[PDB]
Amino acid sequence: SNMWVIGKSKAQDAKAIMVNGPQFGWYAPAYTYGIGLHGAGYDVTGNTPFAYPGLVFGHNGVISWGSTAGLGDDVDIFAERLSAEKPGYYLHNGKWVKMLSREETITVKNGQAETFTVWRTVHGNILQTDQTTQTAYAKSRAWDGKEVASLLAWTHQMKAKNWQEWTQQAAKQALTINWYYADVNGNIGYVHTGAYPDRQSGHDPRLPVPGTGKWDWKGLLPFEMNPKVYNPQSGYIANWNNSPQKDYPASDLFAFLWGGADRVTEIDRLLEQKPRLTADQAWDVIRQTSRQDLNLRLFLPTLQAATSGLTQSDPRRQLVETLTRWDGINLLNDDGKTWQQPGSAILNVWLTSMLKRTVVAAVPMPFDKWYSASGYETTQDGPTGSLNISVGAKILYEAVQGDKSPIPQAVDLFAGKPQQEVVLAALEDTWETLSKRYGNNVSNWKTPAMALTFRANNFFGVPQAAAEETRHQAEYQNRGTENDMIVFSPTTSDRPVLAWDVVAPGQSGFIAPDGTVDKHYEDQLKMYENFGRKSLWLTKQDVEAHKESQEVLHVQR
């Protein structure tokens, strides 16, 4: 999920510009739901996932808000001490304590029902048990018990009129989520929200801790500790699930890392390119980042250095020259199915070989496959979510940076061989693999483009529509499932705020019994495909002027 908020000092023809691209994968019907609420203290417009009471993307005419996943570490695993003599008990603070338990029965269509038990301790629900060591692992979430408060915080924040009122609600959202703010006067802000545990001294948060008492959390850290900034000197706030602040630690998930190689740099490059950005330029950042190969920037220098002394006829050199002439932006050929340049394929094959030769080689099986992915993995329906620099690639980047990396290279990933040698070898593998498939003339290589699919099964893998409702788009775009932009105090309009979004395939998922599709079942699909957008209305005048239908109810509570 990405976001860029442009403040008064970096905006052209406006006081503030907020552009959000939350990435949840693509579905049919739409992942998010468009809604406007007016009354009872609210006056808002926007869209939100699963139609939650609180709008995650929207504005109220005074301020605007958005989010990106925080990826902080708010979950630790406690190793509970069990006893074969006392089943259902665990050792905590010198006493054998009774676990909470509940029976659950799964009813099954055309099958036999299954019942099982779920166990819970003071540290959380038990995930798995190891009778051999007589250990049960409990998952402790810092937000446990604040689930409902977080939903409510996301709702009440919609009524905020300034930074103070908004942060008061941010302090009540307990999940690890980045929150963003912009307003009519040009102010911008950011808060890496959530509850984080105040851990005991010596507690390594990447590994489990004993659950016998001594390692219990002291409580939760105060809101003052949550990374936040209001009106930064840079004039902007950009995020693509990267680190919120210097020295802030990420989630313990092995696949998540915040290091020198990060996709958010692609956004920075575009925002720093020019002194100020207009709303059109800000929106255009979606198009560019959605088509940007994320590895080129990271490894091209290494590739260039390695091929520096080779002759013009050396194929290893030729592959790099191809990369050197490219800005890394992928564009579809007129056939609508292949990419204009073969760079992404070259990088994918090269990077896969490199990882196999370095990180993978240094890690014992079966953990070696945690670092073998190049980041170009897909399905025939295309990527299921956003594209990122793989965890293996991030580690490889630190190794190719040599002394410039702050990460001590405990083990030399190149195993004593010159880096150039390993880089050239991967290039030789690359030439062999690709030349075998496309021939020896690179200029005629038509590499397959990744596509995008609005899936009928929701993110859980559960049908939320009939298979036939699946929709396809030729061009994969590494962008938000939905994109929304709010522009405050435009100098080119008398309105105090302008806002737009796109909710594809459409607002409605309704199909009548006879198969008739609703009038708004697919009217935002093409708009999505070519980076278009529709106006979000807020005021009574605008809503009435663009009114298609109405229904008035009189209900007695």
Binding site: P53, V148, P249, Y371, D518, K547
Partner: protein, 205 residues
């Protein structure tokens, strides 16, 4: 009037709700949701509570068990029970609004029942505040705020220690899964502020 709920849809079918109190406002919201995405919301409810196999079969038994094992429903219910009338109205209103439409659907299915219900062989039932809350808990808290691999991380560390020795194994773990990396691009510039906490990275536990 206190009992009035006005619903207006724009040119893209996006609804705008007008009401005078909390319960009526959210009732309007729930009502338009039931009109626009009833099958999607029904399947999301089954997904978040682990009741998919009840309508789709044995292919989803493991899924349902996995969902139930990952939360404690009574705890969510207790949070709801502690809400003030004003906050409760958000959830109650929302559920009541969806029920008003679901009731209409089940009364005249011949024209209002979404086709998917016929395709998948079942009909929609009413909702309660707990169900509304679980849509959020199961799709925001569990998907975007429940990430961890500590048990596997420990297995990796053990394997590294076995291959390279104790001190070296710990150092390699720190190379592959560092606690912090000072070269990481940060949304907040270092000139503005830095995180004050320093953490153990030697599995001192």
């Amino acid at each position: 009037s206190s009992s009035e709920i006005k619903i207006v849809r724009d040119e893209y079918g996006m609804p705008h709700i007008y009401a005078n109190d909390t319960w009526h406002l959210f009732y309007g919201y729930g009502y338009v949701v039931a009109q626009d995405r009833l099958f999607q919301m029904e399947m999301a409810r089954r997904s978040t509570q682990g009741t998919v196999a009840e309508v789709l079969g044995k292919d989803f038994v493991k899924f349902d068990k996995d969902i139930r094992r990952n939360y404690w429903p009574d705890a969510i219910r207790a949070q709801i029970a502690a809400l003030s009338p004003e906050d409760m109205s958000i959830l109650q209103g929302y559920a009541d609004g969806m029920n008003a439409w679901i009731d209409k659907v089940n009364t005249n299915p011949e024209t209002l029942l979404p086709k998917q219900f016929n395709t998948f062989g079942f009909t929609p039932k009413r909702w309660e505040p707990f169900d509304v809350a679980m849509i959020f808990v199961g799709t925001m808290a569990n998907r975007f705020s429940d990430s961890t691999s500590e048990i596997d991380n420990l297995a990796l560390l053990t394997a590294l220690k076995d291959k390279y020795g104790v001190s070296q194994g710990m150092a390699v773990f720190n190379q592959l899964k560092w606690l912090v990396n000072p070269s990481a691009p940060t949304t907040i510039a270092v000139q503005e502020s830095n995180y004050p906490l320093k953490f153990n990275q030697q599995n001192s536990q």
